[PDB]
């Protein structure tokens, strides 16, 4: 179970992998029975293949970017939350999405749950 400092490291690492579009590396941060709610409110996806499929759908095009927009806030029970911005490209038009992601990590340092908070109000062109 990661310490607060290890949570900050793991979650900053997540953002880096997203930014460079390494699907394989991201999927491996997840526990075998992880769940992903993205956007939070939608039904959760479960299992490594479905999570893999999710990240391929979003990052497969290659041009997607991401960076932290403030520090990671970490707990002493293996959890953390971070604000970030995702730059992506629907029709050639640059757009940005503001997101906050909440993660719970398991006893092996792997992501057990991820919840990503955003909606259309957080999208800009």
Swiss-Prot record:
Changing residue 14 to S: Reduces activity 20-fold. Its EC number is 5.3.3.1. It comes from the Bacteria. One of its GO terms (biological process) is steroid metabolic process. GO terms for molecular function: steroid Delta-isomerase activity. Induction: By steroids. It holds the Pfam family SnoaL_2. It is an enzyme of class 5 (isomerase). The keyword Ribonucleoprotein does not apply. The active site is at 14 (proton donor), 38 (proton acceptor). Substrate binds at residue 101. Disulfide bonds: none annotated. The keyword Signal does not apply. Homodimer. This is Steroid Delta-isomerase. It comes from Pseudomonas putida (Arthrobacter siderocapsulatus). The gene is ksi.
